[PDB]
Amino acid sequence: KNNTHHFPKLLILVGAPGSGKSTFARYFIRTEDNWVRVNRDDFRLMQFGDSLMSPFYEERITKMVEASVIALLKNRTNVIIDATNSSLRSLQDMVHTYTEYADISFKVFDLPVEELVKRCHVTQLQYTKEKFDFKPIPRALKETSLTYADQDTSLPKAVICDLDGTLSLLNGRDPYNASTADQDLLNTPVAMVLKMAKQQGYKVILLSGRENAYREPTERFLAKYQIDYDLLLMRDTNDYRKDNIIKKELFLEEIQGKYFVEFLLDDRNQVVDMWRRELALPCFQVNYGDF
Amino acid sequence: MEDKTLIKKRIDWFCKNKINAFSPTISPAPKSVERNEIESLYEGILWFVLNGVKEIVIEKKYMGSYCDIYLHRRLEDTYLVSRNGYKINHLDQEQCLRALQGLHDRFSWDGVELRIIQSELMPWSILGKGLINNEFSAYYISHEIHAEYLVQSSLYEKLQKIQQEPAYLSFVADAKVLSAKELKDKYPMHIIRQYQSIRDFKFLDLPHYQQNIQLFKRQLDIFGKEAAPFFKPFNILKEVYTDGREHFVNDNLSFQQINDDDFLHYQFTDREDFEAKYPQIRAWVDQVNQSDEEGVVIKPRTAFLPGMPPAFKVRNNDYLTLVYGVDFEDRLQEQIAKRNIKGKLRCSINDWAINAKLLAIPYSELGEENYELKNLVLDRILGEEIENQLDSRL
Amino acid sequence: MILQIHSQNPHLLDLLNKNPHTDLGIYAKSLRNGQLIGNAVSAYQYDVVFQDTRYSYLPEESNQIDFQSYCSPLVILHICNEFFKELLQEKQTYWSQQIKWLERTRAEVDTYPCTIEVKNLYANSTWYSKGHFMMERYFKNIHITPIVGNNLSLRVEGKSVFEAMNLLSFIAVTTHITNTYGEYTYIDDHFAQKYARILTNIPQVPYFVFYLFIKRAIKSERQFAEIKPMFEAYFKEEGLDIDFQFTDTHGSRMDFIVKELGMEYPILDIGCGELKYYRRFMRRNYNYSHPYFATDTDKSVGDYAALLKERMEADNLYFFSDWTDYEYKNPVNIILTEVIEHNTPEAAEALVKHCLSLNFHKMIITTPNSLFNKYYFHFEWTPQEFQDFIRHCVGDTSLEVTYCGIGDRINGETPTQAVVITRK
Ligand SMILES: Nc1ncnc2c1ncn2[C@@H]1O[C@H](COP(=O)(O)OP(=O)(O)OP(=O)(O)O)[C@@H](O)[C@H]1O
Ligand SMILES: Nc1ncnc2c1ncn2[C@@H]1O[C@H](COP(=O)(O)OP(=O)(O)OP(=O)(O)O)[C@@H](O)[C@H]1O
Ligand SMILES: Nc1ncnc2c1ncn2[C@@H]1O[C@H](CSCC[C@H](N)C(=O)O)[C@@H](O)[C@H]1O
Ligand SMILES: [Mg+2]
Ligand SMILES: [Mg+2]
Ligand SMILES: [Mg+2]
């Protein structure tokens, strides 16, 4: 080390109603330099209402709060956050959700209940059981501990390639109508992997989210660009379930336990997540997904 | 001002110092072209009565520097806060404490910790010398010298002679009565220049111009003299008890209590017996005027009414000779048209309304960790920043 | 403004270009709002008054209590170039010139001592911290009488009318450019080279006054270039070779350091309250691609580094206090623009020797010139002293050393010194 390196800050205001956290913040964002406030209550005011809502709404408000904080923290904007939360399951969670993006800090607002209900309510004390110790928590990463899955190394070496948008760019084509798929263009770098792949003992298995009905226009595309493959695995005709569901079935039924997958090449996120997160397998992501 | 980092400084300083009020701008009373009074005693009272304020006080208006006195029971540890937010500490702590026992002795400090009282620290030159010297005395002198010279010299005499000669007049006739941008050009401006420069000279009613300078000189000599420090206290803001509890006074009649055995004033002008009462109040403000004072201040009896300004000031014409020039007296119709107190009044109001909100924080809790205080100060400060851009003769 | 002129000379009124017979001896003309009246009250005495309606010399805007019209050095400045312009001609051109009705040349009629007085002048500056007026130090003919506050009255004495009148105008123009009118303190772009010659028409004005007038009154690089030779020619006549430069030593410096070092090598700033840093990304203009190193013993500077790293723009800024926290083992350009005399003396040799070990491509060092101090109104080296310092630490090695001074040059002496050590 030796070096200076700084990340934005997330300042979590922790405390009860009336305890003066929104007042501090109004002063704070007005005098400090690069700060944005995020209030949960202000959010559920776009949806019209007083500050408790449907477990539908509150789950959606969470989805938004988190997105925004991350959105900003990513932008190197400091974020103060008005935790009406106050618990521990909240706090520890809050910390999990955030620290990796920025340096967390805390500011408590304790205040005698005799004084607290004099900010005019509903006479209700909260879970203030001075826990956790509110020591600042610098940014932490957690994950360079990559651990795959214990696949039988007796089974024959094999790689796995997505077709749509990984070995075969659409070039305008309709995503769901892969009949016109012999016009498709080659993502040569992936093509080049599959080449050198089969130069070592590697079985090359094509696994695709195309209707099986479009098998023929596919085999055309493949032999047109001279792709040397072992299996061609395709989605059942009239299936239409999500990609990762039908690909995973395909994986477990066929590939699984019959081969030893050395890695996978794919494009869209939904699928990459499944491969990595559910099946615990190395998968390289070739372009950008987020379809 | 706006630099976050140094406003942050100023505020911190305000907190550490234990200051508990700021101050309001005070507006002139609204004008009356009718009465040809640029700030009108009448109008300012009427203004109040039509807004429901029917109990009012009228004090003399002291020509000094605004001073919030934080009177403690241990006189020795009192302090002073200026017009805006700052502690005043560059006066002889003795000379001051001495001028403050007068006031201190008018109270009983049993269970009383402190009494925030607003006053005028007198006289002007205690803080204003040199504003007095560099500006006012300078401006006076300039005119005095100039006037003297126009009296003693041959200039005015020689100009009135040429303004009779036959060559001249001929010019002023066949150029005022005849119109062309080349009514030939009687030698390269030569005489077009010279004869146009004369006549476009401003003669001055020399004894008037002197008497007017003398008015200004007079005014300066009332208020501008030095300077044994003393106080005119005019309202108690709050008292604070050792007890822990505080008392928000909110009564502008607290005056006769805290010094000023000076004549206050107090009418319950209810339901326009004002108009019947106005002429008395006028006659009285005239005494204060014919006395040697700046003028008067009109206040509601209840110091803080919601939406109400804190006061209208009504300075006399003679004194305003210090604000506008020597000829303010003459150019009245001009300068009245020119006057506009809306917005001055708008600030006057918010300032005073913030100030009550400030007083509301108990003394015991002024500190750096009180963010209701801090916002309120920053609020007031932004207000300062705005209200400073106004006529500045208000 | 009120201005009486005396002499016992019979042909005064002649010299001032005025006719005592014409309209009672008056000469009138509009000034601004307006009206300026010259007056022969006799020979031996001329009297200029300036009347005014309102706001001739201080913006109507200022809601102030205005009296500039009665005492601003500027009214004087006008009255000169509007009643007495030929009087302010030039040394040669004036003394050798006809008269309306010749009795020889000006050199014969204007030989009688002339006294000129101002009733009320206004000097709001360091140059009249009360008691006295600073040009009294440099001109024995100037006589001040305080009135009140920033106002005084002037009395100017001269051997000739030309000498007297050309001092009054020197007073007016120096007093004005050093004077604050407060928020309305302003100088038009045509000011220089309307008056810039007044500094040259009286004969012992110090260099500092010229510098002052350049930096406070010449708005445009274009216009500085047009006056530059008049100034310099004057100083030649007075026995000094002076270069003059628009930019101001500092920054004239900062300029030199930038153009010399260039952007192709990462900088190592040695003495830094950070200003050299900013300058090195003057927007994209210098597409500065390297990191940027800084050091300083100042705790204050140490902290400000980090106030830019918590974070504003300090992306490639690396700041260090211990010299073993600097580990960058590649080529660097290196800077010492004050530092060596600000203090830490002769450890100054330690510091620079340390630098010469560091893999660099080019060094620049800078110290005051000392031989320059005569020209104004923690040690300090003369160039011989400085050149000796460089010598006895760079010595016996194959380093290429090249000197030059930055800033105005007077007989080869600038106010700032600089070396450029280039490793081969
Ligand atoms: N130090 C103080 N002294 C007096 N009043 C205060 C102080 N601090 C805050 N208040 C007042 O208390 C009230 C509640 O404060 P605030 O709005 O900060 O509550 P909060 O903690 O944000 O509650 P919520 O969870 O509803 O946002 C406000 O009206 C504020 O003006
Ligand atoms: N009886 C009084 N009640 C209130 N204020 C008074 C009184 N007598 C004098 N004053 C002073 O008058 C001031 C307002 O009058 P004045 O016009 O002289 O002040 P100012 O410098 O213009 O201040 P501002 O611009 O804030 O009105 C107050 O700030 C206060 O200092
Ligand atoms: N031996 C040393 N090592 C590191 N820094 C030093 C030093 N000796 C002095 N300094 C620092 O160098 C700084 C120079 S101030 C120079 C500012 C800038 N170069 C300018 O043009 O004015 C001082 O703040 C001082 O604290
Ligand atoms: Mg795909
Ligand atoms: Mg006052
Ligand atoms: Mg001025």
- From CA C158, how far away is CA C186, in angstroms rounded? 31
3-state DSSP helix/strand/coil % of chain B, to nearest 5: 45, 15, 40
Tokens of A214: 């479009």
Q: How far apart are CA B28 and CA B319, in angstroms?
A: 14
Task: Assess contact for B74 and B316: CB atoms under 8 A.
Answer: no
Residues B244-266: b if buried by 16+ CB within 10 A, e if exposed: eebeebbebbbbeebbbeeeebe
B58's enclosing H/E stretch is strand B56-61
Q: Which amino acid is at B86?
A: Y
Q: Which ligand places an atom closest to the C-alpha of C276?
A: 3
Kindly report the number of other CB atoms within 10 A of residue C75's CB atom.
29
Contacts of C125 (CB under 8 A, 6+ apart): C175, C178, C179, C180
Bond prior to B295 in cis (omega within 30° of 0):
no
CA distance C125 to C113: 31
Reference A34, options A58, A9, A16, A65; nearest CA is A9
CB C382 within 8 A of CB C363: no
List the beta bridge partners of residue C424: none
Angstrom distance (rounded) from CA A163 to CA A208? 5
Instruction: Enter the tokens of residue B1.
Output: 């001002």
- CA-proximal residue: ligand 2, atom 19 (nearest): B26
Could you tell me how far CA B65 lies from the centroid of its own chain? 10
Q: Is A75 on the interface with C (CB under 8 A)?
A: no
Please give the DSSP secondary-structure letter assigned to residue B189.
Answer: I
How many residues appear in chain C? 424
The order of strands in the sheet holding A9-15 is A35-38, A78-81, A9-15, A103-109
| A207 close to A160: Cβ distance less than 8 angstroms | yes
First to last CA, chain C: 68
Long-range contacts of A114-121 (CB under 8 A, 24+ apart): A116/A16, A116/A17, A116/A18, A116/A19, A117/A18, A118/A18, A119/A17, A119/A18, A121/A17, A121/A18
Find chains touching chain B: ≥3 CB pairs under 8 Å: A, C
Pocket of ligand 1 (CB under 6 A): A 15, 17-23, 84, 119; B 361, 370, 372
Q: Which residues 295-314 in chain C show a CB within 8 A of chain A? A: 306, 309-312
Residue A114 to chain B, least CA–CA distance (Å) = 16
Tokens 């300012």 appear where? B44
Whether B344 is in the pocket of ligand 2, judged by its Cβ within 6 Å, is no
SS3 category, B329: helix
Ligand that lies nearest to the alpha carbon of residue B259, given by its number in the listed order: 2
Strands A35-38 and A185-186: unpaired
Determine contact, residues B117/B237, Cβ cutoff 8 Å.
yes
Tell me which residue has its CA closest to atom 3 in ligand 1.
B372
Query: Is the separation of the CB atoms in B39 and B314 below 8 Å?
Result: yes
CA distance C183 to C174: 20
Residues of B within 8 A of C25 (CB-CB) are 158
* Chain A residues within 8 A of B1 when measuring between CB atoms: none
Residue type at B229 in one-letter notation: P
Q: Which of C300, C291, C350, C301 is nearest to C326 (CA)?
A: C291
Quote the Cα angle for B287-B290-B294, to 5°. Answer: 95
Host H or E run for residue B214: helix B206-223
Residue C189, classified by CB atoms within 10 Å of its CB into exposed (0-12), middle (13-18) or buried (19+), is: exposed
Among B247, B246, B162, B243, which Cα is nearest to B199's? Answer: B162
Q: CA of B192, closest CA in chain C: separation in Å?
A: 10
> C39 CB under 6 A from ligand 3?
no
- Right CATH number for A157-285 from 1.10.540.10, 3.40.50.1000, 3.40.190.10, 3.20.20.220? 3.40.50.1000
Instruction: Give yes or no for a contact between C360 and C423, defined as CB atoms under 8 angstroms apart.
Output: yes
**Residues ≥6 apart with Cβ < 8 Å to B45:** B29, B56, B269, B274, B278, B281, B298
Neighbours of chain C (3+ CB pairs under 8 A): A, B
How far is it between the farthest Cα atoms of chain A?
A: 82
Q: Strand pairing of C360-368 and C399-406?
A: unpaired
Q: Residue B22: which of B68, B72, B80, B78 has the closest Cα? A: B68
CA C237 from centre of chain? 20
Q: What is the rounded distance in angstroms from the CA atom of residue C148 to the CA atom of residue B299?
A: 39
Backbone angles phi, psi at B378, to 5 degrees: -55, -35
- With CB atoms and an 8 Å threshold, state whether C28 touches B130: no
> Å from C35 to nearest chain B CA?
6
Strand partners, B44: none
Which two structure tokens, joined as six digits, stand for A245?
A: 């569901």
Q: Contact C169/C88 with Cβ under 8 angstroms?
A: yes
**Roughly what angle, to the nearest 10 degrees, separates helices C161-177 and C207-217?**
50
- Give the CA diameter of chain B: 92
Q: Give me the domain span that covers residue C305.
A: 252-423
CB B310 within 8 A of CB B26: yes
Ligand 2 centroid from CA B221, angstroms: 20
Residue among B142, B153, B159 minimizing CB distance to C71:
B142
Tell me the C-alpha distance between A152 and A259, whole Å. Answer: 8
| Three-class secondary structure assignment of chain A | CCCCCCCCEEEEEEECCCCCHHHHHHHHHHHCCCEEEECHHHHCCCCCCCCCCCHHHHHHHHHHHHHHHHHHHHCCCEEEECCCCCCCHHHHHHHHHHCCCCEEEEEEECCCHHHHCCCCCCCCCCCCCCCCCCCCECCCCCCCCCCCCCCCCCCCEEEEECCECCCEECCCCCCCCCCCCCCCEECHHHHHHHHHHHHCCCEEEEEEEEEHHHHHHHHHHHHHCCCCCCEEEEECCCCCCCHHHHHHHHHHHHHCCCCEEEEEEECCHHHHHHHHHHCCCCEEECCCCCC
Point out which residues pair with A78 in neighbouring strands: A35
> Which amino acid is present at C371?
L
* β-pair partners for A36: A79
* Closest among A103, A84, A104 to A14, alpha carbons compared: A84
Element (H, E) at B156: helix B155-162
A39 vs chain C: nearest CA distance in angstroms?
A: 24
Q: Which residues of A151-164 are buried (b: 16+ CB within 10 A; e: fewer)?
A: beeeeeebbbbbbb
Closest-approach residue (CA) in chain A for B7: A31
Q: How many CB atoms lie within 10 A of CB B277?
A: 15
Show the CA angle centred on residue A11, arms to residues A9 and A14, nearest 5°: 160
Query: H/E element holding B67?
Result: strand B65-72
The answer to whether residues A202 and A228 touch, using CB atoms and an 8 Å cutoff, is no
Q: How far apart are CA C327 and CA B360, in angstroms?
A: 58
CATH number assigned to the domain comprising residue C404: 3.40.50.150
Could you give the CA distance from residue B11 to residue B367 in angstroms, rounded to a whole number? 10
Say whether residue A2 is in contact with chain C using an 8 A CB cutoff.
Answer: yes
The nearest alpha carbon in chain B to A26 belongs to: B375
> What whole-number distance in Å separates Cα of residue C337 and Cα of residue C252?
12
**Distance from A154 to chain C by nearest Cα, in Å?**
50
How many angstroms is it from B229 CA to the middle of ligand 5? 15
Q: At which residue do the structure tokens 């976050």 appear?
A: B4
* Interface probe with A: pick from B375, B377, B380, most Cβ of A within 10 Å: B375
Exposure string for B94-109, b = 16+ CB within 10 A, e = fewer = eebeebbeebbeebee
> How wide is the angle at C-alpha C137 spanned by C-alphas C131 and C142, nearest 5°?
75
Gap between the Cα atoms of B53 and B56, Å rounded: 7
Write the burial class of residue B179 (CB in 10 Å: 0-12 exposed, 13-18 middle, 19+ buried): exposed
d(CA C365, CA A248) in angstroms, rounded, equals 69
Does C329 lie at the interface with A, CB-CB under 8 angstroms? no
In degrees to the nearest 10, what's the CA dihedral of B351, B355, B358, B360? -140
Residues β-bridged to residue A232: A206
A33 in contact with B at a CB cutoff of 8 Å?
A: yes
Angle at A147 (CA atoms; ends A145, A153), nearest 5 degrees? 150
- Among residues C84, C17, C28, C40, the alpha carbon closest in space to that of B196 is found at C28
Question: Any bridge partners for residue A13, and if so which?
Answer: A107
Query: Is C344 a pocket residue for ligand 3 (Cβ < 6 Å)?
Result: yes
For residue C413, what are its two tokens? 């002496």
Q: Phi and psi of C13, rounded to 5°?
A: -45, -30
Burial of B339 by CB count in 10 Å (0-12 exposed, 13-18 middle, 19+ buried)? middle
The helix/strand/coil state of B394 is coil
C298 in contact with ligand 3, CB cutoff 6 A: yes
Return left, alpha or beta for B159; rule: phi > 0 is left, psi -120 to 50 is alpha, else beta.
alpha
Residue B187 has, within 13 A of its CA and on its CB side, a CA count of: 5
Under DSSP, the state recorded for B27 is E
User: Do B375 and A33 count as a contact with CB atoms less than 8 A apart?
Assistant: no
Q: Residue A40 and residue A52: Cα distance in Å, rounded?
A: 10
Nearest to C2 among B139, B149, B196 (CB): B149
First and final C-alpha spacing in chain B = 21
| Residue in C with minimal Cα distance to A103 | C310
Q: How many residues are present in chain B?
A: 394
Say if residues A80 and A37 touch (Cβ distance below 8 Å).
yes
- Cα B345–B346–B349 angle (5° rounding)? 85
Distance CA B222, CA C320 (A): 63
Neighboring chain B residues of C29 at a CB cutoff of 8 Å: 193-194, 197
Q: With helix as H, strand as E and coil as C, how does chain C read?
A: CEEEEEECCCCHHHHCCCCCCHHHHEEEECCCCCCEEEEECCCCEEEEEECCCCCCCCCCCCCCCCCHHHCCHHHHHHHHHHHCCHHHCCHHHHHCCCCCCCCCCHHHHCCCCEEEEEEEEECCCHHHCCCCCHHHHCCCCEEEEEEECCEEEEEEEECCHHHHHHHHHHHHHHHHHCCCCCCCCCCCCCCCCCCCCHHHCCCCCCHHHHHHHHHHHCCCHHHHHHHHHHHHHHHHHCCCCECCCCCCCCCHHHHHHHHHHCCCCCEEECCCCCHHHHHHHCHHHCCCCCCEEEECCCHHHHHHHHHCCCCCCCCCEEEECCCCCCCCCCCEEEEECCCCCCCCCCHHHHHHHHHHHCCEEEEEEEEECCCCHHHCCCCCCCHHHHHHHHHHHHCCCCEEEEEEEECCCECCECCEEEEEEEEC
Which chains does chain A touch, 3 or more C-beta pairs < 8 A? B, C
Overall size of chain A counted in residues: 291
Smallest CA-to-CA distance from B223 within B285, B280, B292, B281 is with B292
Question: d(Cα A255, Cα A234) in Å, to the nearest integer?
Answer: 12
SS3 state of residue B226: coil
∠ CA B310-B313-B314, rounded to 5°: 150
Determine whether the interchain pair B371/A30 forms a contact, defined as Cβ–Cβ distance below 8 Å: no
Q: Which residues of A touch B11 (CB under 8 A)?
A: 31
* Annotated resolution, angstroms: 3.4
Q: Residue B121 in contact with residue B229, Cβ under 8 Å?
A: yes
DSSP calls for B81-149: E-SSS-B---S-HHHHHHHTHHHHTTS--SSEEEEEEEEEEE-THHHHTTHIIIIIIHHHHHHHHHHHH
Q: E strands of B262-351, at which residues? A: 266-267, 295-300, 312-315
Residue A64 — φ and ψ, nearest 5°?
A: -80, -50
Query: What's the CA angle centered on C353, arms C351 and C354, to 5 degrees?
Result: 65
Q: C30 and B197 in contact by Cβ < 8 A?
A: yes
- State the number of CA atoms in the 13 A half-sphere of A24 facing the CB: 21
